[PDB]
């Protein structure tokens, strides 16, 4: 029933095995009790949820010298990230990128013939299921042994009041509560949505007991929809995306968005805009057999036995909002001020629970800032001007303004991009670097080597936006964004030391134009 | 003989084709003459060589409003980079990484059975030869049409004196000369070094007319040797590296270097330290049949019909020094002051010609600084504290101080790395991100997911060094290094916005420890 793990010190691999056993427990498994029974201090904060926001907030609070407690219904820390969100998404995207390369060079060099080859979606999901306890293990281990945190896992938390939480049969008090229970997968209110064969990111890694047929229907047009859709397409299946409005509106630069969309279509993906599913058809056995949708051109029917819903995420605020009387936003997000404080005294909310942006940097930092405030360090947090990214069969990175956006916003600008604007268009051997060299050199594949661009204010000479499609630039955007927030100019970018051949050619391309007082686009 | 191209406007692809024809022409091909015969201004500088240093120096000088002329014996601009250096090297490294991936997951999912599979080296070299004109075409096009450069290609320059140069049968005067002829491949002074089957980066892409046997011997232990050696090994050939002293001394962090070397040996590479080739054995046909070398454990003979020399490059200074009277350094490098000025009046030297470090940033920047000085802007260039990288089957990036180096420097330090130092060792699902997810999740492949670390001063809290083995961090090191030179602390690093899952986990890991006054390693 209840396991006092406090004085047990499992290694990373032992935790992995223990977590698996607890997950495959018919009765649900024993509660993991990791509380220090010597500490006389009252918890400065109890975190409802031990995902990215809860675990990081706890790590920072503890590091500051305060006391904290995490209560999570899962037998592992880390939350959705390692179980059904970021981690599997990246494994699937890695597969999508490698498969695109394999299909492109099928039967050439060492690449086998991919012609009639269909990779199994379940096959790959099963790979993730078989190894996700690795990350689970690291989380419990690092949190307990390295970050000195206290926690109770595999036990839903019962919030009594703004200072009281019930867990593992016990009752705990705390000066503050930090709500970090995240969000749940959006869905549709159409007939058949509950049919077997309908999945979302969460159920996909829990209930896929068959290998999908040749046609897959994805509903949605943003990150999740595109990331998973490209993976499904990559396995060799006809992938049809049903987008309510238009896809990838997140990509503000028009040329960048068009490149990403064109490359998706070139891989065989079908994207139908202005479409709404009206019915998911069931066969005699209650399994999906087709999807019916209304489009600008009328109703359409797509035969499929596998539907993936990539809609938004809805903050799990209902219960907590009822018990505490928290003020909520129009999408159900818990409202909070710049210090992450809710409408209820001593109650904070962080991560996905407070709405967009739903990213790991937001979850972790909000968690930490809430902790710092709980510890007396009054610090505000209002996420703005952050870099962003998503996967198709490529890595797509972006920060700041798109080109048209900047011109419309009154900025006189010049752009520096690759490939250049010429009659040969994308059919040239640049941009190019790690993981795009085969495309750059292959027969008829040069247009696949990538696309990138920086938008610059002609007068201040400052970089207003950066955009990249290819591989190996995502990490750089984290640091480039800080430099840009500090006031980076084309001259300063040009005076840096590049590491050729570089995923982003921004440094040397800037240098080619920085010598003039009057900037010219490249 | 001389094609006046000034008023012709070939596209990138037409340039690619034209250059191909000139390179294959039995008579040597026409001279490409792109000079503005109506511009009466004197040349501020004539660049001898139009590779990285000469082309960027020219672009910057023209951008500043000056007049320049490039003379290059190759029919294209860009120099060794696109023809036989950086570019092919990256195509080979891309293959090496994909091949290690395919061999690791041999016969799994979409991966073909690699067991008895030997990839053709000539096949890949041939792929490079067939597509290198793409990059050549862009160089000629961009230079002429976007950068407004004047140039004469496919013509060796004949320097008359410090103000006079003959090209295309014409004599040109200039206020200055900027020498940018680069360096030639290093060789060994041993018997048989001229036997067929012995190559260096340059001859490999011009003279490989056979497919190498099952064993390859590489001589050298730094960047070139290791990059090409891993590629050869990845094709499925037994690869022995003969290192005069120690391999990869450039990787100062012992722990980082060890991981890299261990992964190489795991791939089957044999790295022999303190070894010197004494003789290269030829068979009766004049082809290498074996290599004999002295080692710490005596003499050894390796049978092979393919030897690759990855020694250093040797500045092409002889002729120019005899004509102009240039002071040379011990390795034949042209000596220059911090303004890139040689001992000769109005003569500058840049790029590989002035010695190490021989990198593209150094070549391009020295060319631009020399150009600025020629234009009246007194500015010094002294390369120091720059990021660096190299390829094995992984991308290896480093900057600043290694852990041991920081301590010997008198710094009290802590480090944050992945994976953590536990008894499970590297056999854990971290670090992980794009292109390392399969290793992170594969059966028994977790130790291959990478290694990374930042070195921090325990008192000042400043990051003194960063090291990474995996994929996708190289571009990031370009920007991160700038931040580090600015005085980056673990607190500032921790307050950035990460894009999870990130090649470098530095941001969030720093955040996990930044909450404490007294830092503790992770
Ligand atoms: C498919 C997908 C892919 C994504 N990929 C990325 C990506 O690549 N990069 C990125 O930056 N972001 C990505 N995100 C977004 C990111 O996953 C989230 O923003 C982040 O996980 C939110 O963390 P959190 O701590 O707020 O919530 P969560 O991780 O959702 O965790 C909430 C935690 O609280 C627990 N909990 C809930 N209710 C209770 C209760 N009553 N009692 C006890 N415990 C409870 C849960 O079990 C869970 O552990 C992705 C999201 C999805 C859906
Ligand atoms: C195998 C290899 C891999 C490398 N990989 C990288 C890498 O990944 N990243 C990096 O940053 N650096 C890399 N480098 C180093 C980089 O290639 C060089 O530092 C850089 O190319 C030097 O540029 P440069 O302009 O000084 O010389 P070069 O590029 O060598 O060009 C000199 C030019 O002068 C011309 N020339 C010579 N003699 C005459 C003459 N008499 N008349 C007219 N023209 C003449 C040549 O034809 C040529 O175009 C690599 C080097 C090698 C050998
Ligand atoms: N960094 C990453 O890699 C990553 C990956 C996945 C998710 N995330 C984050 O996780 C959150 C949720 O992901 P998300 O992809 O769903 O993003 P989102 O930006 O919330 O987009 C929701 C998508 O679902 C569609 N949608 C919502 N309700 C619908 C309905 N009733 N019918 C039809 N379509 C509907 C929307 O279409 P319209 O816009 O056309 O209405 C839109 O394409 C986001 O904040 C996101 O940024 C990040
Ligand atoms: N960024 C990149 O990817 C990249 C790739 C290739 C080259 N480069 C640059 O190009 C330049 C030359 O490349 P490099 O790889 O040769 O680097 P380098 O650092 O100059 O190393 C020279 C290597 O050649 C060996 N060597 C030299 N003379 C030798 C001799 N007589 N006998 C046996 N071994 C001998 C050295 O051995 P010992 O040191 O053990 O004596 C050493 O391993 C460098 O400045 C380099 O950084 C950069
Ligand atoms: O952000 S956390 O480290 O808690 C989970 C990463 S998978
Ligand atoms: O540095 S140059 O742009 O001249 C050649 C790059 S391959």
Short mmCIF file of N, CA and C in Angstrom, two decimals, chain B residues 121-199:
data_model
loop_
_atom_site.label_atom_id
_atom_site.label_comp_id
_atom_site.label_asym_id
_atom_site.label_seq_id
_atom_site.Cartn_x
_atom_site.Cartn_y
_atom_site.Cartn_z
N UNK B 121 33.47 3.76 -50.69
CA UNK B 121 34.06 5.06 -50.41
C UNK B 121 34.10 5.87 -51.71
N UNK B 122 34.52 5.24 -52.80
CA UNK B 122 34.60 5.93 -54.08
C UNK B 122 33.22 6.41 -54.49
N UNK B 123 32.22 5.61 -54.16
CA UNK B 123 30.83 5.92 -54.45
C UNK B 123 30.46 7.26 -53.80
N UNK B 124 30.82 7.43 -52.53
CA UNK B 124 30.51 8.66 -51.82
C UNK B 124 31.37 9.82 -52.32
N UNK B 125 32.65 9.55 -52.58
CA UNK B 125 33.54 10.58 -53.09
C UNK B 125 32.99 11.03 -54.45
N UNK B 126 32.51 10.07 -55.23
CA UNK B 126 31.95 10.35 -56.54
C UNK B 126 30.69 11.20 -56.41
N UNK B 127 29.91 10.95 -55.37
CA UNK B 127 28.70 11.75 -55.15
C UNK B 127 29.16 13.19 -54.93
N UNK B 128 30.22 13.36 -54.14
CA UNK B 128 30.75 14.70 -53.87
C UNK B 128 31.24 15.39 -55.15
N UNK B 129 32.04 14.68 -55.94
CA UNK B 129 32.55 15.24 -57.18
C UNK B 129 31.43 15.68 -58.12
N UNK B 130 30.34 14.91 -58.13
CA UNK B 130 29.21 15.19 -59.00
C UNK B 130 28.38 16.39 -58.58
N UNK B 131 28.43 16.76 -57.31
CA UNK B 131 27.60 17.87 -56.88
C UNK B 131 28.33 19.09 -56.36
N UNK B 132 29.66 19.06 -56.35
CA UNK B 132 30.40 20.19 -55.82
C UNK B 132 30.27 21.46 -56.64
N UNK B 133 29.86 21.33 -57.89
CA UNK B 133 29.69 22.52 -58.72
C UNK B 133 28.49 23.39 -58.27
N UNK B 134 27.56 22.80 -57.52
CA UNK B 134 26.42 23.56 -57.02
C UNK B 134 26.99 24.71 -56.19
N UNK B 135 27.79 24.38 -55.17
CA UNK B 135 28.40 25.40 -54.31
C UNK B 135 29.30 26.34 -55.13
N UNK B 136 30.00 25.79 -56.13
CA UNK B 136 30.87 26.60 -56.98
C UNK B 136 30.05 27.66 -57.68
N UNK B 137 28.92 27.24 -58.24
CA UNK B 137 28.03 28.14 -58.95
C UNK B 137 27.52 29.28 -58.10
N UNK B 138 27.14 28.97 -56.86
CA UNK B 138 26.63 30.00 -55.97
C UNK B 138 27.73 31.00 -55.66
N UNK B 139 28.95 30.51 -55.47
CA UNK B 139 30.05 31.40 -55.16
C UNK B 139 30.29 32.41 -56.28
N UNK B 140 30.35 31.92 -57.52
CA UNK B 140 30.57 32.82 -58.64
C UNK B 140 29.42 33.79 -58.81
N UNK B 141 28.20 33.28 -58.71
CA UNK B 141 27.01 34.11 -58.85
C UNK B 141 26.90 35.18 -57.78
N UNK B 142 26.94 34.76 -56.52
CA UNK B 142 26.81 35.70 -55.41
C UNK B 142 27.88 36.79 -55.48
N UNK B 143 29.12 36.36 -55.72
CA UNK B 143 30.25 37.28 -55.80
C UNK B 143 30.06 38.37 -56.85
N UNK B 144 29.72 37.96 -58.06
CA UNK B 144 29.53 38.90 -59.15
C UNK B 144 28.23 39.71 -59.09
N UNK B 145 27.10 39.01 -58.97
CA UNK B 145 25.79 39.66 -58.98
C UNK B 145 25.27 40.29 -57.70
N UNK B 146 25.66 39.79 -56.54
CA UNK B 146 25.15 40.38 -55.30
C UNK B 146 26.18 41.20 -54.52
N UNK B 147 27.45 40.77 -54.59
CA UNK B 147 28.53 41.44 -53.87
C UNK B 147 29.28 42.45 -54.73
N UNK B 148 29.04 42.41 -56.04
CA UNK B 148 29.66 43.35 -56.98
C UNK B 148 31.16 43.27 -57.05
N UNK B 149 31.68 42.05 -56.98
CA UNK B 149 33.11 41.84 -57.02
C UNK B 149 33.65 41.71 -58.43
N UNK B 150 34.87 42.17 -58.61
CA UNK B 150 35.56 42.04 -59.88
C UNK B 150 36.51 40.88 -59.64
N UNK B 151 36.65 40.01 -60.64
CA UNK B 151 37.53 38.87 -60.48
C UNK B 151 37.96 38.28 -61.80
N UNK B 152 39.08 37.58 -61.76
CA UNK B 152 39.64 36.90 -62.92
C UNK B 152 39.95 35.52 -62.40
N UNK B 153 39.23 34.53 -62.93
CA UNK B 153 39.38 33.15 -62.48
C UNK B 153 40.00 32.26 -63.53
N UNK B 154 40.46 31.10 -63.06
CA UNK B 154 41.12 30.11 -63.89
C UNK B 154 42.40 30.68 -64.47
N UNK B 155 43.09 31.47 -63.65
CA UNK B 155 44.34 32.10 -64.06
C UNK B 155 45.29 32.27 -62.88
N UNK B 156 46.46 31.62 -62.92
CA UNK B 156 47.39 31.79 -61.79
C UNK B 156 47.81 33.25 -61.78
N UNK B 157 47.93 33.84 -60.60
CA UNK B 157 48.34 35.24 -60.56
C UNK B 157 49.86 35.28 -60.59
N UNK B 158 50.42 36.25 -61.29
CA UNK B 158 51.88 36.37 -61.34
C UNK B 158 52.21 37.74 -60.76
N UNK B 159 52.64 37.74 -59.51
CA UNK B 159 52.97 38.99 -58.86
C UNK B 159 54.27 39.56 -59.40
N UNK B 160 54.21 40.83 -59.78
CA UNK B 160 55.36 41.54 -60.30
C UNK B 160 56.11 42.23 -59.15
N UNK B 161 55.40 43.04 -58.36
CA UNK B 161 55.99 43.68 -57.19
C UNK B 161 54.85 44.05 -56.23
N UNK B 162 55.16 44.70 -55.11
CA UNK B 162 54.11 45.01 -54.13
C UNK B 162 52.95 45.90 -54.58
N UNK B 163 52.97 46.34 -55.83
CA UNK B 163 51.88 47.15 -56.37
C UNK B 163 51.44 46.69 -57.75
N UNK B 164 52.10 45.66 -58.27
CA UNK B 164 51.82 45.24 -59.63
C UNK B 164 51.59 43.75 -59.78
N UNK B 165 50.51 43.40 -60.47
CA UNK B 165 50.16 42.00 -60.67
C UNK B 165 49.72 41.71 -62.11
N UNK B 166 50.19 40.60 -62.65
CA UNK B 166 49.79 40.21 -64.00
C UNK B 166 48.71 39.13 -63.92
N UNK B 167 47.63 39.32 -64.67
CA UNK B 167 46.54 38.36 -64.73
C UNK B 167 45.86 38.44 -66.10
N UNK B 168 45.48 37.28 -66.63
CA UNK B 168 44.82 37.22 -67.94
C UNK B 168 45.62 37.99 -68.99
N UNK B 169 46.94 37.87 -68.92
CA UNK B 169 47.79 38.56 -69.88
C UNK B 169 47.77 40.07 -69.77
N UNK B 170 47.22 40.58 -68.68
CA UNK B 170 47.16 42.02 -68.46
C UNK B 170 47.87 42.38 -67.16
N UNK B 171 48.29 43.64 -67.04
CA UNK B 171 48.99 44.10 -65.85
C UNK B 171 48.08 45.05 -65.08
N UNK B 172 47.92 44.80 -63.78
CA UNK B 172 47.08 45.63 -62.92
C UNK B 172 47.89 46.25 -61.79
N UNK B 173 47.60 47.50 -61.48
CA UNK B 173 48.29 48.19 -60.39
C UNK B 173 47.30 48.29 -59.22
N UNK B 174 47.81 48.36 -57.99
CA UNK B 174 46.93 48.51 -56.83
C UNK B 174 47.71 49.21 -55.72
N UNK B 175 46.99 49.84 -54.80
CA UNK B 175 47.63 50.52 -53.69
C UNK B 175 48.17 49.49 -52.70
N UNK B 176 47.59 48.29 -52.71
CA UNK B 176 48.02 47.24 -51.79
C UNK B 176 47.78 45.86 -52.37
N UNK B 177 48.42 44.86 -51.77
CA UNK B 177 48.20 43.49 -52.16
C UNK B 177 47.75 42.78 -50.89
N UNK B 178 46.85 41.82 -51.02
CA UNK B 178 46.41 41.02 -49.90
C UNK B 178 46.61 39.59 -50.38
N UNK B 179 47.57 38.93 -49.76
CA UNK B 179 47.94 37.56 -50.11
C UNK B 179 47.00 36.60 -49.38
N UNK B 180 46.33 35.77 -50.17
CA UNK B 180 45.35 34.83 -49.63
C UNK B 180 45.37 33.52 -50.41
N UNK B 181 46.57 33.00 -50.66
CA UNK B 181 46.73 31.76 -51.42
C UNK B 181 46.62 30.47 -50.61
N UNK B 182 46.31 30.60 -49.32
CA UNK B 182 46.15 29.41 -48.49
C UNK B 182 47.35 28.56 -48.16
N UNK B 183 47.08 27.27 -47.98
CA UNK B 183 48.08 26.28 -47.62
C UNK B 183 47.85 24.95 -48.38
N UNK B 184 48.92 24.18 -48.54
CA UNK B 184 48.85 22.90 -49.24
C UNK B 184 48.89 21.74 -48.25
N UNK B 185 48.39 20.55 -48.63
CA UNK B 185 48.39 19.39 -47.74
C UNK B 185 49.78 18.99 -47.25
N UNK B 186 49.88 18.66 -45.97
CA UNK B 186 51.16 18.23 -45.44
C UNK B 186 51.42 16.80 -45.88
N UNK B 187 52.69 16.40 -45.89
CA UNK B 187 53.03 15.04 -46.28
C UNK B 187 54.09 14.47 -45.34
N UNK B 188 54.50 13.23 -45.59
CA UNK B 188 55.51 12.57 -44.78
C UNK B 188 56.78 12.38 -45.60
N UNK B 189 57.92 12.38 -44.92
CA UNK B 189 59.19 12.16 -45.59
C UNK B 189 59.57 10.71 -45.31
N UNK B 190 58.91 9.79 -46.00
CA UNK B 190 59.19 8.37 -45.82
C UNK B 190 59.15 7.72 -47.19
N UNK B 191 59.79 6.55 -47.33
CA UNK B 191 59.78 5.87 -48.62
C UNK B 191 58.39 5.34 -48.96
N UNK B 192 58.00 5.49 -50.22
CA UNK B 192 56.70 5.02 -50.66
C UNK B 192 55.55 6.00 -50.45
N UNK B 193 55.83 7.15 -49.86
CA UNK B 193 54.78 8.13 -49.62
C UNK B 193 54.12 8.56 -50.92
N UNK B 194 54.79 8.33 -52.04
CA UNK B 194 54.23 8.68 -53.34
C UNK B 194 53.60 7.51 -54.08
N UNK B 195 53.47 6.37 -53.41
CA UNK B 195 52.86 5.22 -54.05
C UNK B 195 51.38 5.54 -54.28
N UNK B 196 50.78 4.87 -55.26
CA UNK B 196 49.37 5.09 -55.51
C UNK B 196 48.63 4.48 -54.32
N UNK B 197 47.49 5.07 -53.96
CA UNK B 197 46.75 4.56 -52.82
C UNK B 197 46.98 5.42 -51.60
N UNK B 198 47.89 6.38 -51.71
CA UNK B 198 48.16 7.30 -50.60
C UNK B 198 47.45 8.59 -50.96
N UNK B 199 46.58 9.05 -50.07
CA UNK B 199 45.81 10.27 -50.33
C UNK B 199 45.84 11.27 -49.17
#
